[PDB]
Amino acid sequence: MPNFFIDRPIFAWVIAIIIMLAGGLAILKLPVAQYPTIAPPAVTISASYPGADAKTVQDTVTQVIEQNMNGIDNLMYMSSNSDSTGTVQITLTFESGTDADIAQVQVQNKLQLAMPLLPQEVQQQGVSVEKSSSSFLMVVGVINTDGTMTQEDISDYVAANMKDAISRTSGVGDVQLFGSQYAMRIWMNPNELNKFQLTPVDVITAIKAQNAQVAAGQLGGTPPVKGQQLNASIIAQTRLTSTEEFGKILLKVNQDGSRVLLRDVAKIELGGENYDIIAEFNGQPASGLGIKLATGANALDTAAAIRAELAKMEPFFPSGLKIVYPYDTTPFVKISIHEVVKTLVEAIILVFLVMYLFLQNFRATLIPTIAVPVVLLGTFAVLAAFGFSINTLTMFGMVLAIGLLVDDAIVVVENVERVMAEEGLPPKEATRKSMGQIQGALVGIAMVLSAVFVPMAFFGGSTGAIYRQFSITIVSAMALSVLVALILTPALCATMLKPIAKGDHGEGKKGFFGWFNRMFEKSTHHYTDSVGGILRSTGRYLVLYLIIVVGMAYLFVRLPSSFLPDEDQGVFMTMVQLPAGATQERTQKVLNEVTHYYLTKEKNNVESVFAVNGFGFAGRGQNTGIAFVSLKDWADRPGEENKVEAITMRATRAFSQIKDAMVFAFNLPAIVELGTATGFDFELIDQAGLGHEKLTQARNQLLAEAAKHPDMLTSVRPNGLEDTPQFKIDIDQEKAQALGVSINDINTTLGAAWGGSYVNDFIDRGRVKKVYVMSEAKYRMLPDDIGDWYVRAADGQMVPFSAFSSSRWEYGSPRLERYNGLPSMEILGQAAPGKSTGEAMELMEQLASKLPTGVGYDWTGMSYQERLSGNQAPSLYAISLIVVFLCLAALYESWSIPFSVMLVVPLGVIGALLAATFRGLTNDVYFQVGLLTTIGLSAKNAILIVEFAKDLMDKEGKGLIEATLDAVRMRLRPILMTSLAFILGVMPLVISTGAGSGAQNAVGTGVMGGMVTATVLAIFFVPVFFVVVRRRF
Amino acid sequence: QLLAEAAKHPDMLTSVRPNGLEDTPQFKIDIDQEKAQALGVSINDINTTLGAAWGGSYVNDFIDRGRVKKVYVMSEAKYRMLPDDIGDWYVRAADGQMVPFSAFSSSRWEYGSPRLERYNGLPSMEILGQAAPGKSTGEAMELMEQLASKLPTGVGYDWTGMSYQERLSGNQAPSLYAISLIVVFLCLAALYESWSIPFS
Amino acid sequence: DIAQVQVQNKLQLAMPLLPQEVQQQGVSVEKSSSSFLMVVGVINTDGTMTQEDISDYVAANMKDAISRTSGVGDVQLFGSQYAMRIWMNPNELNKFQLTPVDVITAIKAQNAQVAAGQLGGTPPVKGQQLNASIIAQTRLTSTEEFGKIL
Amino acid sequence: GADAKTVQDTVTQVIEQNMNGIDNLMYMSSNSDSTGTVQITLTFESGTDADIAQVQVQNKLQLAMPLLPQEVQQQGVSVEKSSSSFLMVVGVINTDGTMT
Amino acid sequence: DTAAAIRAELAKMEPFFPSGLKIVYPYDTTPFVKISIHEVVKTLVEAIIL
Amino acid sequence: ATRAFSQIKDAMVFAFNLPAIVELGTATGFDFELIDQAGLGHEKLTQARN
Amino acid sequence: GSDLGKKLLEAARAGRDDEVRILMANGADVNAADVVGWTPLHLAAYWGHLEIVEVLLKNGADVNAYDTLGSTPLHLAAHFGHLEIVEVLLKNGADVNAKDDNGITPLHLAANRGHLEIVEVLLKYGADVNAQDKFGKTAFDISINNGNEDLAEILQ
Amino acid sequence: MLELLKSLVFAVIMVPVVMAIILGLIYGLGEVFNIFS
What we know:
- This is part of a larger assembly, with 6 copies of chain A, 1 copy of chain G and 1 copy of chain H.
- By secondary structure, chain G is mainly α.
- Chain G has helices at 3-14, 17-25, 40-46, 50-58, 73-79, 83-91, 106-112, 116-124, 139-145, 149-154.
- The interface between A and G is medium-sized, with 15 and 20 residues.
């Protein structure tokens, strides 16, 4: 090929132009996002049964669905939660690669067939099916400076005048609203109902009968009489809009001719559907819009469009009402991507400088600067083809591929200049000769790096979904690099270079560069003499090789594992939890204390605090809450002490010394899907119908026996709520019948009064809204109020609840949970320092094997994957080693020579294990990929050394030692060029404090150290291995 | 206003017309619950009588020739025609009293839309047209774009169907020639190893 | 996977037109072959339990986990799940001036979960210290509780 | 039994909001009549799997039936691919006047 | 694969079956497939040797 | 089995081995469907079948 | 109210003997009540912690404590079938005929759930069988309705 | 337009320093392996 493009350079320029245009169009048409679809596809069925507890809901709703959740394809598992708020959440999780639409549909369809078995209240509220494995691209907040508009008014304004616009914006895929739009609240009074001998049932029936619709037909409709010259559509009683209209509703007419209307007996207002959740923003009432991004979208342009629409609409808002942005992770993405782009450009500038430094030719430097961007743009086009995006993982794969690109260019240019200098040849024939030397080397390098990287794509689960990005990115980059080295760089070196003859260019020039040539010649001669002295006795160095292998194995074992490193995304989360039996008042007190803390003792760093009451992840009840703490930009807070980890530790210190509560501060995980580093998720299941009580007994016993193994386990705990007090009302039917009371009326009164009842719909100005009847706070707040509620018998007399209803206290679960249709308890835990996940995950099985009968167990989350698809890395890397050995045998046409190369894998590896060990890192994804990159570079250098030596020995008969010394002499220059360029292009990733610092450092450390060690060691041990293998065989 | 402006252009636009229906008279019947309750009559019985008598009432099914068909209860034509025909329709009270609608029902006329259109979540009105013979459709679309520019504020315009795709055909074209030229130029320089043979 | 979707999108229009006795029992739209992949029998080696008692175990503990397995499609049960079966005697009903409708209403009334609300719920008063879910009427779990039905 | 102004606020506008945010949507129209009949037509880009489109719409729609009158649900809400123009028009006639 | 999944699932309740219950497989079509494939593989090896 | 079962009274008992493709039946068999397209009924259709 | 009493309540609820001893040695209150009126005795009996009941009793835990609705540790011990708890409570002065806001006594509770081993003790310790609840029913009617003829014989 | 000049400054500064560091490491390892002989 190269001899086809040296004589045809326009062909090569044309291919390069085509690749550049492809990549350019791609970078315009490529979606941008922080992370790809890593977590497996899930779907959440959310339901609500107002006024119910956990058991009522688990019985009438959850079990019914779960029994009809059959016949769905690719299902990994499902887990159900049932809260005392009536809420139900059934999360199904499917095998990776599944289509999150067809699965959602199968689920919605099974549920649509199951609905007729649910009670009318659930069919009437609504059972929704959503996709769970997503996260809020943004959260918009809306507040009022004045205390006029409250939470519900702001929520209504949002639902009406803002949601539809945000949804009609580009890229916006899903828009959830925090808070509920207006709703006609009807707070009744039992005293004033008994006064008129009424009941809540009468209110319900009147409201049902006096707000409905009526079809009334037409005038002159078909079939008409012969002669009709007129037709008209009739309009009968329709829904009501105002509040007075609801006040004018008749309930009863007395013997004295008086009229009974609602406005006399029932305080009517325009409130919300649920007050369970209360949101505040720096103490000010607020409402919110959570925005999940769509498929194939650009988060940046999407957030820009959203900020533009909200700005357009701001001027049309009420007075004092304004907008805010608590949770916006878009700036973190912008900075993290801009940093990688800057790094890519610096890696070109550094290549230019290095080339000009060693090769004083500017026309030589011009070449890599043209060859590397072509490859990057071609890689972008390749991604666009396969359906990938511009994300963190892809760009970090590119900043690791740049080294391979740089080597593929620099080896060619350096060898061409070397030939032109030694043999005095001109550019064209020199390029012919150099490519004749380097063709098979580049091809075998391509195959080797493919064998090294492709095996990662074929892992299982989220781990594999992550590794696939790096793998495909780097393979595309390397393939385009090899095609470029065979196609374009030769033609460029033929038409751009200039002639030099018979001179090492180090004695005829003066200045820094002449002196550098002098010093480099001296150092080359010294390295040559050292290698020559080495090759006289080798075992003295094979022993050092074995020592290094032992040391790197030790460092590998004593290095802690990980999944991904936490970062500073400009936000973090505080979690508030209270004892059993708390309320809104106390939780809001605690949250206001939290806010006062952050806004006073962290003013220098914190900007806002968005507190959501009644929303914890461990529970969506009433004694729980959160705070989305938003920070300033990384420019307005420098220093570790002003970062998120120190803030978190300080906040935990200031909040652990608190009263009657449990407050924690933590950092937003890397991927909102919590994949811990060494923790697990253990489900304890009831396989025999034991119950909640025996299952809780077994849970407590297991936690006890787990606290006795702190050497392997720690922080073991349940991920649920503990039983709380519950008020039991025992009705007697004998009295209810004697007095002539309908148990149906009894329970309808009780419910509609204490929990709430959704009756019918009404039409506000435009949109349609609900109607909720309920008691009034001061009449549904204690047991002493039970006897203040009356029912109506058949004979007409009114009866108090106290006549037939005894009462007790008991204990009951506020949040029940199930795993695959059977009751369960979720348990969390970490592996103790020095131990891994497998050991603890096997210890927990050993423990659970000693539990009562009927109790079983299972694994969820990362523990599922880690167990089903967590032991296949050795097999694929064995495949890799075998393919590499075979490709090297083909290249060298020998079964033994390949070892000379496959023994440099440790030399770089250890250099990465030392650094990561010094700087205090772990064995995360980025480290795992930098390792392979350094290994590929070391193998590249070794392959060229070996092939040069072998070509000299075979086609010139120089001999073993002479050929090897000549090879290393010719190969020093490019090795150092590539190593220096890569080390410099990476160093910023190591000295980094700000956005993406964790991933930057994890990528940069293990490759800086890797190349540092692979350059100054391989150049010595590779000749040793080569002469060893050739003298043995 | 737009249709009036267009009717002054029979050389470009012809057959201009909206794809809709004009506002029409509607007959509202107000039911007074108070008087029906005073007379022992139920709101629901009244609604059912009115519906069955003026619009039909799907009751249940039946079996004709082995197939399942419907059963509709309805009034005779001569009792559904005029707003003065109502009042002949009576009801049974709790006692059984024949109560006429004329006691608790009032009536009036209004104007309303029998068909409301929206386009991309916004109120809209569709207008179909042809190009005048001899002319084309691009000329007519240009003229209509002009006319819709003089209209009041807040009134935007858009194209649908053959007028949307057509628009693309007019904007794709430059980006289609240019590229189709470049790919040729390059393809020649490669085959003939020169930047000049292409330029000639 | 698309045929099922079209079929069910069409059947969701008919479902309302069906009686409630058919909806309650549950309409199924399965996507499966017409031939048994396999049969899985369950027996007693001790002769302790009988057909009904094995069928109940199979249904309540084994049918639901297997019908969620991937590739199954449809599962037929060679038995029947337990159910509180109530055998009426017409002579004893006439002896007490009763009919099956009375029994049905009494069961639907005295065997029911009810949404009884919260004790201390929101929007609450200023200064509330207690919150507690109310329990009023639970489903029945044995024949003893069904007998006591008045 | 609905005036178009009603249906355009209690059924149509309650669905249209959900249909914003689909993969390859090009435009959409909607028509609310005096007989209550509602037709919301979504037109996608050329080359889309019309089946996957119907599917995504079925998915974005169930987010709304929680908010629709029971008289809409009990009558059925159809999500079906569409075409504006007829392929054929078959006619059936009696030649002997023995029918109407 | 489906029969494998089914056997794996049944292997998770067998520990929890009350005293007396026993699983049995009176009708399975899958073993015949695996065996008819193993026999053809045996044929291939025999033919290579021949 | 079929021979020893024809000697049973008040029953049709037939044993058979399932074919290779259970979705395909007897070789050279035929499945035929009589249909009523005029509103005749089950009785006249039974008469026609017979 | 000191958090010592609250931690004592929590430890009794969770079954922690060593922690309860540690707390009482620091002088923790035992008449302490939850927001519903349940002292450590109610919690230790409800959940069945005999050791905790003995510990709390040795240090002056009011056996006759009553919650906001007339419930006592004896009521719960009888309802949930904790024979040892019943015996221990009576040894130290548990009013076997304690009457709640509804007139229901440990007899009616132990009879509603079929606890004969407990009705024996209740009776022989002086439990009035004819004790009527609010509606007019006794342990005899509660045994006839529940269909426990054995109990009805135990109560003649 | 100012960050790139800072990067180029960093480069012109470190390139020779990093080169000298690597060359000194090579010289040290060479002297070591020469001592080993």
